[PDB]
Amino acid sequence: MGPGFDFAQAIMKKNTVIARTEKGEFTMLGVYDRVAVIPTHASVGEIIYINDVETRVLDACALRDLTDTNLEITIVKLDRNQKFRDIRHFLPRCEDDYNDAVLSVHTSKFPNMYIPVGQVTNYGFLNLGGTPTHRILMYNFPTRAGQCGGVVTTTGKVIGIHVGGNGAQGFAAMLLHSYFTD
């Protein structure tokens, strides 16, 4: 409808795949080359389904901060025959608050879904499903099951992936440029 949704659409059309693990179907954001991210609670194994095709996982790393606290981001390298468009220049460098964010989801259940979630708070610490978690972003939308892995964007930035909600607020794990230097 407007330039928020325009940036979100451009990320979804080129930089997302449907990932299926034994824990369900997730929106998966491709970042560069064969490297993608998914919430750690997807429990990625040796094999994953990508757009319903059996795919070997070459590497999977569940990120933690330097205090050994969960960040709820898994970086996955896929044995895929195609690279993602490099979107690392759209990643923030520092922890921050944001105006006017969109949460975008693409699954079997929720195809081409875009939610204007509005203002995003640097929440920091959250007890997420009983796990102490850092670098959490919070928005006031009553987000539901099937939105995990959803991409959170502003105009010009990819700031996080949806990892949970409490019926009133949604929670995203931060994406930082420094996760994907190589």
Method by which the model was determined: X-ray
Active-site positions read: 41, 72, 148
CB 173 within 8 A of CB 135: yes
CB 134 within 8 A of CB 65: yes
CB 181 within 8 A of CB 90: no
DSSP states of 18-86? EEEETTEEEEEEEEEBTEEEEEGGG---SEEEETTEEEEEEEEEEEE-TTS-EEEEEEEEE--SS-B--
